[PDB]
């Protein structure tokens, strides 16, 4: 998270390879003489590439400052491309009871929806001996009421030892969608 | 003559002179300290605005901009281009209690500027506006 800003009369690195207002390629210079460029010709730097190992910094005006990143409001509005996934986590127990298992798998069905990542846990109950035939048994029950909806990413692993059961969940992709939506069609209206 | 706290009232007549200049022709200072930023505006007698600087135009981000070296920064930079334009004598003009309340004010001084007098004109109303509900925080 950065913004279009000058950085200021404080610089953290001693060589930067500085540019001109008009593009120009001053080149690499003195951390001291960077300053006195803003000086000699009222301007402030901004830092145009961090990624470049060599500082990059370009020197303009504050109009110049301002349309920039006034275009940057756009080309975001304009093609938006936000991909960052959140992942949510859940923490059951083999002898959950049902209620509370509708009003949690309802919770699930919200993150799947706002195409979430949902790490599911299975512990042992409270003084409970269960194997992993029974344990792994929600998953399936959970997945079955988002038909569509939902898909298997990860699978379930004994993370600890076998006494716990982890599982991912996912929104299912669009392609995968319509190879689900095709292969629903045929089963009743062929038939 | 003694030496009184009170300004120099312009009608009548004074002989408090600053540079040749009366105490209406000074400049000013106009500071705005706020809790998350602190904007200091110089200006003339005739309100023509000669210097601006912030935190944020300092190059300061969040929360550096509410700090007392942020404000002294700003005071500078605001000290260093009115200073350029032949001011050297301000009338400061403080307008909230932020951090950068004070420190703005010795910014100002360690650019070479002068100051007179310290005018507070923070914004108390006779009951006016609502504010936001308090906090839990």
């Given at each position: 998270k950065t913004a279009f800003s000058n950085v200021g009369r404080k610089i953290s690195q001693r060589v930067i390879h500085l540019f001109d207002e008009k593009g120009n390629d001053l080149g690499n210079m003195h951390r001291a003489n960077v300053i006195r460029l803003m000086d000699e010709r009222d301007l402030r730097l901004v830092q145009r590439n961090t990624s470049t190992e060599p500082a990059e910094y370009q020197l303009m005006t504050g109009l110049q400052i301002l349309q920039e990143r006034q275009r940057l409001r756009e080309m975001e509005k304009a093609n938006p491309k936000t991909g960052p996934t959140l992942?949510?986590?859940?923490?059951?127990?083999?002898?959950?009871?049902?209620?509370?298992?509708?009003?949690?798998?309802?919770?699930?069905?919200?993150?799947?929806?706002?195409?979430?990542?949902?790490?599911?846990?299975?512990?042992?109950?409270?003084?409970?001996?269960v194997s992993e035939n029974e344990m792994e048994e929600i998953f399936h029950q959970i997945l079955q009421t988002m038909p569509g909806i939902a898909t298997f990413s990860s699978?379930?692993?004994?993370?600890?030892?076998?006494?716990?059961?982890?599982?991912?969940?996912?929104?299912?992709?669009?392609?995968?969608?319509?190879?689900?939506?095709?292969?629903?069609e045929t089963q009743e209206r062929d038939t | 003559t003694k030496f009184s706290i009170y300004p120099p009232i312009p009608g009548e007549e004074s002989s408090l002179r600053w540079a040749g200049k009366k105490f209406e022709e000074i400049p000013i200072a106009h500071i705005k300290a706020s809790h998350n930023n602190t904007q200091i505006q110089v200006v003339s007698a005739s309100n023509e605005p000669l210097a601006f600087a912030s935190c944020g135009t300092e190059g300061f981000r969040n929360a550096k901009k509410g700090t007392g070296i942020a404000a002294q920064t700003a005071?500078?930079?605001?000290?260093?281009?009115?200073?350029?334009?032949?001011?050297?004598?301000?009338?400061?003009?403080?307008?909230?209690?932020?951090?950068?309340?004070?420190?703005?004010?010795?910014?100002?001084?360690?650019?070479?500027?002068?100051?007179?007098?310290?005018?507070?004109?923070?914004?108390i109303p006779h009951n006016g506006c609502r504010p936001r509900k308090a906090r839990k925080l």
């Open positions: 992942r949510k986590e859940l923490i059951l127990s083999s002898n959950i009871g049902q209620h509370d298992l509708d009003t949690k798998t309802k919770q699930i069905q919200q993150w799947i929806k706002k195409k979430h990542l949902v790490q599911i846990t299975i512990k042992k109950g409270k003084n409970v001996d699978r379930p692993q004994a993370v600890q030892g076998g006494k716990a059961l982890m599982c991912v969940l996912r929104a299912l992709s669009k392609n995968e969608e319509k190879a689900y939506k095709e292969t629903q | 005071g500078i930079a605001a000290a260093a281009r009115a200073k350029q334009k032949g001011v050297i004598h301000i009338r400061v003009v403080v307008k909230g209690l932020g951090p950068g309340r004070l420190s703005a004010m010795h910014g100002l001084i360690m650019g070479g500027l002068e100051v007179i007098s310290i005018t507070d004109n923070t914004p």
